[PDB]
Amino acid sequence: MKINRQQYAESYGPTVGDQVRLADTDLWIEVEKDYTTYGDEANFGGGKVLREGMGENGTYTRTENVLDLLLTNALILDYTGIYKADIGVKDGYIVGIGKGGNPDIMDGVTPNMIVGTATEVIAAEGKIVTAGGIDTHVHFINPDQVDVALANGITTLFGGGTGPAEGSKATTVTPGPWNIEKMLKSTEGLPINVGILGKGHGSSIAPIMEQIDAGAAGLKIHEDWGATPASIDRSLTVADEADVQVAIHSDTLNEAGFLEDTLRAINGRVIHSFHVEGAGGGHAPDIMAMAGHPNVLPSSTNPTRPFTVNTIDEHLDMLMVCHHLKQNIPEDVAFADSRIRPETIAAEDILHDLGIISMMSTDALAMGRAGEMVLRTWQTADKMKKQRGPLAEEKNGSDNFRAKRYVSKYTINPAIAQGIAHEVGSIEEGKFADLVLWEPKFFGVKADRVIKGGIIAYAQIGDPSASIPTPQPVMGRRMYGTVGDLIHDTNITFMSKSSIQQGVPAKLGLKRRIGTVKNCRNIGKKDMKWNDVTTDIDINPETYEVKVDGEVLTCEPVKELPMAQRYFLF
Amino acid sequence: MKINRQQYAESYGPTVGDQVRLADTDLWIEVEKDYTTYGDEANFGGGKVLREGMGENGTYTRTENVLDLLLTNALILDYTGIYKADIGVKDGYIVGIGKGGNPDIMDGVTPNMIVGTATEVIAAEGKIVTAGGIDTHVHFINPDQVDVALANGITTLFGGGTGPAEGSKATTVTPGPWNIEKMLKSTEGLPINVGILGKGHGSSIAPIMEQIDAGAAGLKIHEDWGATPASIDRSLTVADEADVQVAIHSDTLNEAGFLEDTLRAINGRVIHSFHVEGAGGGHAPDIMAMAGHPNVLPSSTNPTRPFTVNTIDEHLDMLMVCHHLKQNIPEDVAFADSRIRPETIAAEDILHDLGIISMMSTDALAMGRAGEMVLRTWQTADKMKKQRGPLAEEKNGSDNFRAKRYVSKYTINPAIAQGIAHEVGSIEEGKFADLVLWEPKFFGVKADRVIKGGIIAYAQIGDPSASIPTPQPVMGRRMYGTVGDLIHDTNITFMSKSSIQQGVPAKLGLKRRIGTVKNCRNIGKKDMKWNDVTTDIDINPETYEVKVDGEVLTCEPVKELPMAQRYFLF
Amino acid sequence: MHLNPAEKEKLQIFLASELALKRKARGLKLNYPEAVAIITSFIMEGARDGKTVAMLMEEGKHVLTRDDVMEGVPEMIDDIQAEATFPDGTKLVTVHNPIS
Amino acid sequence: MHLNPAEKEKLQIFLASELALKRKARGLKLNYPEAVAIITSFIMEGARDGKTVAMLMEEGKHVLTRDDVMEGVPEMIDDIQAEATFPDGTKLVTVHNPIS
Amino acid sequence: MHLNPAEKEKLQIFLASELALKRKARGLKLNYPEAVAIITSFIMEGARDGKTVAMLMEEGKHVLTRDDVMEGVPEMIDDIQAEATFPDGTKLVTVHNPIS
Amino acid sequence: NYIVPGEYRVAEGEIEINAGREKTTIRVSNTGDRPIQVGSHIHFVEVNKELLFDRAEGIGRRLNIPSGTAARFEPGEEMEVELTELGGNREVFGISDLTNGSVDNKELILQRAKELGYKGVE
Ligand code: NI
Ligand code: NI
Ligand code: NI
Ligand code: NI
Ligand SMILES: [O-]
Ligand SMILES: [O-]
């Protein structure tokens, strides 16, 4: 018995060599390998394979190699590969990637992926499955931002803020022990993973360090609090002792130094450079040169991603409104013109494509969109394919190399940068089961189902009064993982080792899973998956032209993007 | 002083011999008896009876025969009777049905129904009061389904699921110890009573039983997990040891047996037969014959209720879409034609009317409507009055016999079937105060107020910014019983005796009231109130015609129903 | 009014349909959610009118054509489902391949 | 806009009224929630127009008649109440027996 | 439809704009939230039409004039901001001093 | 260049199911008066008693059809089906309780099948 490839893909999802279009982009991913045994595919329903004595084992108790959940026939898109497998979850973690079912009667069953009495089933046939997005530039301004993030496949928010206070509206900072304690308690109600940044400012160690001991997961250095050589130095001395990451928004004004002064203060220590292009902040005009250095973990924020015909008009006005700048005050116009630069925004598209900028992030509600990190990653990759062609590394006419380079920017690389990649950031055995299912037609636009700690937290689903769940209106809705005390077991609060050792969770009555931040200080650009390029970036101080290896990096802005007006009601 | 009967009913609600129309149906209920003393009726407001030294006692402390709540002048509709009384609540339970007030000055006060300093008042004059509905076929797919259920007077949800996973979308199953623990924690946030079903599938006892010990309240056998003789047998062996109920959705495909094989596996043990007509699932075409047997507790699900001109077109297409069936694959068409049968749907209306099907249920979001169990019960009773006439048992031109037969189907009978009728399912002294107030014009359509454990949980109420609560927009809203920690005291989590003995509530930190499932294994069809008929049901395998006592059971589908377009905006 | 949860949600469908119909009237090719909203509201208004489930399964295939919508939208919409109150109570309508 | 909770809710009344008015325009006899929505929106638009509470108590009895609504609807509606911002601030309007 | 949270919220703006436009059509001088709703919906419909951010910064200053709104409303509105999906993705429009 | 969002471009070729396993064709009759549908992965000897076939030829086997599909027998219908071999450990538990162990125990499986009235024990 043979099945042609069209019929096979329609029934089980695609297999080896098959390609899938990502939404309405020009990007194609190809199945690299498949863990199945043809004829023994797992599936669930009437007369289907996962039934007692058949593909479901009726003998084994839960402890005996049985799963709590099997995702059947997933097309995984991850830094580790683009491939077809079943995904097995147990105790909220990914325990097996391979082939699930019943070793009684099936060949090729992964030994700890038994479908038993204890196993729930999610059908992933025809879906793309990715890790949950890791957003490391979150301003906590408006709690309505959490559902926005979940709807675009984001499962971890790292950043700071106390709500719509001016410090929080400008900076990813929860300042001091008391504000950190209050926001750790607030976090008990947020259905997403969270880590909190303290204020990376001070000239004495104790005021900074007491934030880490209070339960901060890292620090933010921001020019609005004084991005001085002293604040940079003390923050990195604290970070090196505490094993947490430091993010920086540098001195745009060059008030106490130029970029070379900020790099001298850093003194070779590991740092996460936020919005490294500089529209979102940093030494005018040359901050993006940070992305060449081996001790810098460089991210973009999303409103410059990718370079479009409305970008400059939008950004110049946004900057003038947000800074209360006057069109008739020449210092204000000079400042805006020094900060919003088509030359560095166009080069930023290309530096993403070359693997020189390693990460994406939002800048949610400060200068960025909580629900567009994943969206704009793929719009950038699509624009670069259309302007620069398939990368030299591609084969088979697929965009797999580009797809692994770009998926890494919002999954594994932020997790490595933050010291949380032991828990989240990729679809690997032993990591927390934060998984996003996508219909390919909606890939990177609207998540189908968001799994948090092995339970669905968020889903596009219809009328709750209907006979079945698909009738209109189909909209993003919080699911049972967010309800009651299950919100505690499905989400992680990431905290410093010192706050955990000092018992802060018990002191504050935190019931969430507690994740430990670690292995942040040892890493560098070389540890960024698919995005590990170091090079001398030259930014001309007169023309703002960007050069790498003697070549000007420039591209045109586009008039239209995929993943845009086909999908959105507004 | 005499009051004519029109004026009396307008002031105090109806009294002995008075009739009330149920919504816009042709059904009339008649007041059978009245506990009042004429002239000493309780009422609350300016210059009214329940004032200190008058109808309110000013002497007694709460412990001294005083109520926490008095519902004044209720028209009770219950399996126990259709009658007028005051209802007294204390400690969240119904403690008195009779006459409330002050024995200082009033005749005929029920001794434990004193209105005192501690007593709240709900005016029920002109309202019909019923027990909260007990829905025993709930798929936990979308948490928005809880308000849908409350708005139509449902107060208990028994079933299973983990959200919109395929196992849960098909089957009322929360599988295994870990998924059960996670959903018991989720339940802490659901403002309704809950019991969770485990997977009734396995060939070894231990994988099934460990679900009961983890906190399941029962099991579900579903053909999508293999409704085999082995799974049936093991599930009933577990149920007999654990004192919990088993629900079955049998082998529609007749793959491992016909109906007689499923009955042989059951071997005379008590079982709850879900959607017994079979459109919702079961041995094709003759599953409804289950409803004749003395060890079967038979329920309908609601989309076949009652038989209408759009039913077959709707159901054939729903089945084809949900099973991914193709109109041009003759096996798919043959399967659909074997499962969706006007002959068995028309007979199901009549078997309800004859007391041969004992229960209603939803099948919420799998093949049924979360908010239409009560609605469709009364539409069925109205259709049967219009097609079959008043039942022989009626007197006075009232429909009281039919009203007690039909109210039993969604109140007391599901509660008896599930082993929870010591706590819920009827308006009786000693049971939990889950009470639904209905305006007669909205009876069975939209609940006025839903009381959960003696506190209002849900109400049709207006503008929260207004001087008074009645201005538009009047809509269903969660009330203070759902807020903060009061959600714990107003709702019951029903669990197995073994999980309770093993301390599962303390292990998981459950704060809800814990109800014990018991006395499930001793009962049969004879224990179904007003619906206790056993008989030989013959289903012709060639024509699908249904015969009882040598007579074909058939009726016409109707073009219009009451409780429909007069009421609903969509 | 006594709105239940479904009545409150389904007002949104009507509103989205009105928005989409104004976009169509000023000459725009409609997108995915616009097209879904128009066909969904059509089904629920048809039920209100007292049409049968069978009539609406037929009519729903003729509400929008290929040239009313953007490239790819016809192939994105495999079917549109709505529940509404017919004269004989709530029923499910599924319109298969509504835009050819 | 600075919408408060009441402003957000009361948009729903206007929307339900627009839905009901389209149903009436295509010849349907209106049901209970349709009739309530039309009369309620009329009151709130009247307040916006600067009518008095007394004018709206009168006018609200003439917005829909028996032959605009289904059997039984007139007897289901004992009164319709709305609060709206008059020129002299929020006031309550009750229309008694709006449909004879 | 697959509505995300922003799509669900922004339906409210369109609805408030429709309400305000009916008030303007029957001769009322518009208030603060009415004026904001009309200009906001205009921006989001303009993006849907495929106008540029620069075109909408210009046009948004000519949607309502002083004589369309109540005393003080022009001076209450320093700027109106909206995000919408342009052909090149979401962009922010700020209309400065929209009513002179 | 028309874009269908999320479309597949499948590779050339065909997928062979149950490759390398022995195939067996047998005749099967539904002697009952109600339809019987049999899934791809049920141990074939343990199907409905009223299916008449050489029960020995179902031992250690299942239908050679795509995973998750089924064969349908209308009342009175006789037809040929193709079986493939069970894999993994070649053990069956539960279902009709005819095996509960190795499929190699053919005499014990057939003795149980004959005692319980599974048609075609020869
Ligand atoms: Ni910044
Ligand atoms: Ni920021
Ligand atoms: Ni079922
Ligand atoms: Ni069900
Ligand atoms: O920022
Ligand atoms: O079901």
Automatic annotation (TrEMBL), chains C, D, E:
Its EC number is 3.5.1.5. One of its GO terms (biological process) is urea catabolic process. Its main location: cytoplasm. It is found in: Cytoplasm. Keywords: Cytoplasm, Hydrolase. One of its GO terms (cellular component) is cytoplasm. It catalyses: urea + 2 H2O + H(+) = hydrogencarbonate + 2 NH4(+). Pathway: Nitrogen metabolism; urea degradation; CO(2) and NH(3) from urea (urease route): step 1/1. Heterotrimer of UreA (gamma), UreB (beta) and UreC (alpha) subunits. Three heterotrimers associate to form the active enzyme. HAMAP family: Urease_gamma. Belongs to the urease gamma subunit family. This is Urease subunit gamma. The gene is ureA.
